[PDB]
C-alpha cells in the first residue's frame, strides 16, 4: 500500500517490491528508475534487482513517491520517500593571519599547512608556488613540498601570502613586511529609483545577477535602464533584492548588493 | 421573595458532550434551581437538542410565588472545527498562518459565529490569521477560540516553530586564472550556518553550476576556454523544507592566451599559369587579441615562399610549370601560433 | 316515503372475483332489501356479466309503492389490464417507465377509464408515466389504480430496481515515452463499479482502441513510430444490459528519436573530367527536428573530402584524373547519424 519512509542523509534505503518478479520501479513524474535487474537512467544513483530497489546517497532530489509494479502490473507498491536534513553545522574559522618581518638580504622560510603539497598564492592574484615546482622565477623564491623560502627579499616582497593543502580544506595566511574592489551594500526604498555606477568611461559595461540573467537584455522580468556607464532602477520592488556585478572588457568590475527596505 | 425578577438576568452556559453528542445547559447561579417538569438537578439541564426551543420552570425555595418559566435555545457547535497551520513553505521563516477547517456540517448559521485569536501579545478577530516579520528560530504559542452568541465554548492552543533561512554570505578573497584552462577561486566560509556551497560559472554565452563541500575553501576549475572571460557566483545554501540559498558573492576573471585552432574554410583557386588565390575564414577560437595569417609555399618539403597578411587573401606567382607545391596556412594571434593547415596544389604551364 | 325516493341516492360497491371472473354488487344499506324476480338476499348480488346493463328493484317494509328501479353498469374485467415496463435500456440508469395495456378489448368504451399513478411523493393521472433524475443503485416503489368512470375497480403495485451505469472516472497517474518504441501509461481504478477499461491511441493518421482487464493498472505500448505524438484516452466501462462508459481521461506524449534510414535514389552523374554531381531525396523517416546532409568522399579507402550541406546537392571538383572515388552520403537529424549510402564511381578521363 502507501507507506512513509524518512531515513537520513547518505543512507542506502531499500524499498521492497511486490512478489511475482520481475518488477518495474517508476515515479509519478515519469522518470524511469528500474526495469527488472537492468538499471535505467544512470544519472540517478540507485540499484535494482528482480523484486526490490535500493537508493544510494539520497538527498533532496529523492523526495518523491516511488511506485513498484509486478510482472503483470495488477499490484502496486507506493513509497513516499522524503529526506530530513541533518542539523546545520558551524564551520570552524581558518587560522588567523600572522605578521612576519624580514630584513634586507635575508632568506625567510614560511611553513605551509600540514599535508603535502602546499600551494602558495599572493594578494595580487598570482600563482607563486604549486608544489616543488616554482612559478614566476623573477621573484627569486623557492618552494619544497612543505614550506616557501624567499631568497634575497626585495622591498616589493611585502604583501600577503596564502598557503593551501592539496584538498584546500585548511589555510595559512602570512603578511610579509620588509624592514630596511570591495562590494558595496546599498539599501533602496521600495518604489524609488536607484543609481549604480559602473566601470570607467573606457569600454562597454556588462551586467550579471545572482539569477545569472543579464538585466540589460530585452524582455527582462524587471524594469531597468542601462547606459554605457550607469544602471538605473525604476520603481524598485521586493524582487530587486540580490547582487549585481558590472564589469567591462578591461578586467574591471564592481559588485553591488541591493537590499530593499 | 419573588422569583420572577431574581432569575430574569440569569446566564446559561451550554456544554457539548462527545460521548453522547448532547447539550447540557448550566445556570450561573450558586443556589439550587428546582423543577418539576424536567430533571434539573443541582444547576445543570441535560438532554437538549440543538436548534430547538425548550421551556423550563425556574423557582427557588427562598423566593415565593409567583413562579416563572424560561425558554432556551442551543446553537453552539464545538468540535467540527480543526486548527491547521497554513504557513507557506517558501516564507515559513517569518510568516505564520492559522486557519480553521470544518469537517462536519452543522445546522448553525455562520452569522452568529466569531473567531478570536490571542497570539502572545497580539489579539485578532478573523477566521484565518497571518503573521509577518517574525523572528526566526523562535517557538511561539497561540490560542484560538470560537464564540457563539458571545460565549466561550471552544478553545484550542497551538505551538509553532519557525524554520531556518537566510544563510551566507561567502566572502570571495580572489578569483583568477593563470593558465589557459585552469582557474583558481579562493573564498572564506560564512559565519552563519549553511550546507553545501553552490557555485556557478558563466562564460559569454554558456553557464554551468555545481556544489562544493562546506570544508574546502579553495577550488580549481578545469576545461576552460582560453582567452575567455568568466564570471563566478558562489552562495552558501542550506537545505530546509525549502532550500534557502542566501546572498551570493560574484567575481570575474579572464583566462590567459593559448595557441588557436586550425584555420577554417581553406579555399584555393587557380587563375593564371602560376598564380593561385588562397583565402580562408578566421578560426572559431581566436585565443588572441590580434589577427594575422601566415601562408608558406614549399616544394619537395623545402620552404621557398613565406607571406603574412592581416587578412586571409594571398596570391602566389612566379612558380614552375606543372609543379605540385604545398601551401601551409596558419594563424598567429601574436603570442602562440596555431597549428598549420596544409594543402597540395599544382600549377599550369607556359603557352 | 316511497321506496323510489328513499333509495334514490343508493350507492353500489363492486367486488371482482378472478376464479369466476365475475363482479358482485353490494348495496351500501343497513336494512335488508328484498327483490321480486332476482334473488337479492342480504345486500349482495352475484353472477353479473361485465359491460351489460342490469335492472334491479329495491324495496323495504318501511316504504310503499313505487319500488326503486336501479340500473347498474358492470365494469370490464380486471385481468384485461396489464402493467408494462416501458423503460429504455439506454436510459435505464436514470429513467423508469410504466404503462397500462389492454390486450383484450371489451364492449365497454375506453372514454371513461382513468389511470392514476403514484411513485413516492409524485401523483399523476396518465396512461403512461415516466420518471427521470434517478440515482443509480436504488430501488423504487410505485402503485396505481384503474377507475371505471371515476370509480375504482383495479389496483396494482410494482417495484423497479435502477440498473447500474455511468462508471468512472479513472485518473491517469502518468504517461510517458522514455524509449524509441516503448511508452508507459499508468492510471488509477475508478471508485464506482466497473468491469474493464478501454484505451484509444490516436496519431496524425489512425486511431486504434484496445480493451484491458480491471486488474491491470499499467500498460506498455510497443511498436510505435519514433518521434511521433500520440493522444491516449482511457475510460472504464461496465457491461450492463447496454455497455456504460463514463467520462474519459485524456493525455498526450511523444516518443524519442532514432537514427534515420538511408537516403533514396542517390543519383551520381558526371560533370567534367574532375567534377561530379551528387543528389538524393530526403529519407522517408526524418526522425528528428533538424535536416542536414553529410557527404564523405574517399579515394583508395582513405577519406579525402568531408562536406555538410542543408540539401542533397554536392559538387566534387578538383579531383584526380583516372582514379576511383567512393561517395558516402547520409542524412543527419541533429541527434543521431543515419546509415550512410555508399556508391563508387571511376573518373574515367585522360587529361
Ligand atoms: C625584485 O623583484 C623584481 C620583480 O618584482 C625584480 O626586478 C624587476 O622585475 C621586473 C618585473 O618582472 C622586471 O621587469 C621586466 O622583467 C623582464 C626582464 O627582466 C621582462 O619581462 C620585461 O622586459 C621587464 O623588464 C625588471 O627587469 C626587474 N629588474 C631587475 C633589475 O631585475 C628583482 O629581481 C627583485 N630583486 C631586486 C633586488 O630588485
Ligand atoms: C551504498 O552502496 C553503495 C554501493 O556499494 C556505496 O557507494 C559506492 O558505490 C560504488 C559503486 O558501486 C562502490 O564502488 C563504492 O565502494 C561505494 N562506496 C563505499 C564507500 O563503499 C555506498 O557507500 C553505500 N552506502 C552506505 C551508507 O553503506
Ligand atoms: C529491461 O531489462 C531486461 C533484462 O532484465 C532487458 O532485456 C530484456 O530481457 C527480457 C527478459 O528479462 C527479454 O525477454 C527481452 O528480450 C530483453 N530485451 C528487450 C525487452 O529489448 C530489457 O531490454 C530492459 N528493458 C525493457 C524495456 O524491457
Ligand atoms: C544528490 O544525489 C544525486 C544522486 O544521483 C547525486 O548525483 C547527481 O544527481 C544530479 C541530480 O539528479 C544529476 O544531475 C547528476 O548527474 C548526478 N551525478 C553527479 C555525479 O553529479 C548528486 O550529486 C547529489 N547532490 C548533492 C550531494 O548535492
Ligand atoms: C527482495 O525482498 C524480498 C522481501 O524481503 C526478499 O525475499 C525474502 O526477504 C527476507 C527478508 O527478511 C529474507 O529473509 C528472505 O531470505 C528472502 N527470500 C528470498 C527467497 O530471497 C528477497 O530476497 C529480496 N531480493 C530479491 C532479489 O528478490
Ligand atoms: C639565500 O639563498 C641563496 C640561494 O641559495 C644563497 O645564495 C647562494 O649561496 C651559496 C652558499 O650558501 C653560494 O654558493 C651561491 O653562489 C649563492 N648564490 C648566488 C646566486 O649568489 C644565499 O646565500 C642565501 N642567503 C642567506 C642569508 O642565507
Ligand atoms: C482550553 O481552555 C481550557 C480551560 O478552559 C484549558 O484547560 C486547561 O489546560 C491547562 C494546560 O493548558 C491545564 O493545566 C488545566 O488543568 C486545564 N483546565 C483548566 C480548568 O484550566 C485547555 O488547555 C485549553 N485548550 C484546549 C485545547 O482544550
Ligand atoms: C516517517 O516519519 C513520519 C512522521 O509523521 C512517521 O509517521 C512515519 O512512520 C515515518 N516512517 C518510517 C520511520 O518509516
Ligand atoms: C554536503 O556535501 C558533502 C559532500 O558530499 C556531504 O559530506 C555533506 O553531508 C553534505 N551536507 C549536508 C548538510 O547534506
Ligand atoms: C536556490 O537553488 C535552488 C536549487 O538549484 C533553486 O531551485 C532555487 O531557485 C534557488 N533560489 C531560491 C530562492 O530558492
Ligand atoms: C614570413 O614573413 C613574415 C613577414 O611577411 C615574417 O614576419 C615571418 O617571420 C616570416 N616567416 C614565417 C615562418 O612566418
Ligand atoms: C460506450 O458504450 C456504448 C454503448 O453504451 C458503445 O456504443 C461505445 O462504443 C462505447 N464507447 C467506447 C467503447 O469507447
Numbering used by the authors:
A (entry chain C): 1 to 180, 244 to 324
B (entry chain A), C (entry chain B): 224 to 574
Reproduce the article's own wording on this structure.
CD45 is a cell surface phosphatase that shapes the T cell receptor signaling threshold but does not have a known ligand. The primary role of CD45 lies in regulating signal transduction events within immune cells by controlling the phosphorylation status of tyrosine residues on various signaling proteins, such as lymphocyte-specific kinase (Lck). Whereas CD45 contains a large extracellular domain (ECD), it has no known endogenous ligand. A family of adenovirus proteins, including E3/49K, exploit CD45 to evade immunity by binding to the extracellular domain of CD45, suppressing T cell signaling.
We determined the cryo-EM structure of this complex and found that the E3/49K protein is composed of three Ig-domains assembled as “beads on a string” and forces CD45 into a closely abutted dimer by cross-linking the CD45 D3 domain, leading to suppression of its intracellular phosphatase activity. The CD45-E3/49K complex is a 2:1 asymmetric dimer, where two rigid CD45 molecules are positioned in a cis back-to-back orientation and shifted at an approximately 30-degree angle relative to each other. The membrane-proximal regions of two CD45 molecules are in close apposition, likely translating that proximity to its intracellular domains such that the phosphatase domains would be sterically hindered from free access to their substrates. E3/49K uses a “beads on a string” interaction mode with CD45: all three domains of E3/49K protein converge on the CD45 D3 domain, but each uses a different contact surface, resulting in an asymmetric complex. The CD45 D3 domain contains three entirely distinct interaction interfaces with different domains of E3/49K. The E3/49K R1 and R2 domains engage the “front” and R3 with the “back” face of D3 domains in a perpendicular and parallel manner, respectively. The R1 and R2 domains share an overlapping, but molecularly distinct, docking site at the “front” face of CD45 D3 domain with ~ 682-Å and ~ 430-Å of non-polar and ~ 596-Å and ~ 436-Å polar buried surface areas, respectively. However, despite both interfaces centering around residues Arg399 and Ile440 of CD45 D3, they use starkly different detailed modes of engagement. The R1–D3 domain interface of CD45 monomer “a” is mediated by four hydrogen bonds (H-bonds), and many van der Waals (vdW) interactions involving R1 residues Tyr26, Thr28, Gly30, Leu31, Trp32 contacting mostly Arg399 and Thr24, Tyr69, Gly73, Thr74 and Lys76, which contact around Ile440. Strikingly, Lys60 of R1 also forms additional H-bond with the other CD45 D3 domain.
